[PDB]
Amino acid sequence: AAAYYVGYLQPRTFLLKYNENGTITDAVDCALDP
Amino acid sequence: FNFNGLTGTGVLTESNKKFLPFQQFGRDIADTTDAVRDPQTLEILDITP
Ligand SMILES: *[C@@H]1O[C@H](CO)[C@@H](O)[C@H](O)[C@H]1NC(C)=O
């Protein structure tokens, strides 16, 4: 009938980007790749 | 000025920014306050040195 998902969080560093209105529209996960 | 306990000096001017309901202050790349919401008129002001 329905479905749901479950994922855990870890302490990491992220680089966010705010657009002209102040909304977050992109991000980068430092130390996820080289 | 003294906006909800925050003191400083500058020139206040009307702004065109739209704060979300849970936000009160705005900062720049230098970590300094440039915008504020008046706690009575609920309008947004710009701070300039
Ligand atoms: C974001 O700001 C621009 C101008 O800076 C405006 O044209 C646009 O409508 C704004 N976005 C929203 C969702 O209001």
UniProtKB/Swiss-Prot annotation, chain A:
Name the domain of life this protein comes from: Viruses
- Sugar-bearing residue positions: N21
Q: Where is this region: Putative superantigen?
A: 19-34
What is this protein's function?
Answer: Attaches the virion to the cell membrane by interacting with host receptor, initiating the infection. The major receptor is host ACE2. When S2/S2' has been cleaved, binding to the receptor triggers direct fusion at the cell membrane. When S2/S2' has not been cleaved, binding to the receptor results in internalization of the virus by endocytosis using host TFRC and GRM2 and leading to fusion of the virion membrane with the host endosomal membrane. Alternatively, may use NRP1/NRP2 and integrin as entry receptors.
What subunit structure does UniProt give? Binds to host ACE2. RBD also interacts with the N-linked glycan on 'Asn-90' of ACE2. Cleavage of S generates a polybasic C-terminal sequence on S1 that binds to host Neuropilin-1 (NRP1) and Neuropilin-2 (NRP2) receptors. Interacts with host integrin alpha-5/beta-1 (ITGA5:ITGB1) and with ACE2 in complex with integrin alpha-5/beta-1 (ITGA5:ITGB1). May interact via cytoplasmic c-terminus with M protein. May interact (via N-terminus) with host bilirubin and biliverdin, thereby preventing antibody binding to the SARS-CoV-2 spike NTD via an allosteric mechanism.
Q: What is this protein called?
A: Spike protein S1
**Per the UniProt entry, what species is this protein from, by scientific name?**
Severe acute respiratory syndrome coronavirus 2
Gene that encodes it? S
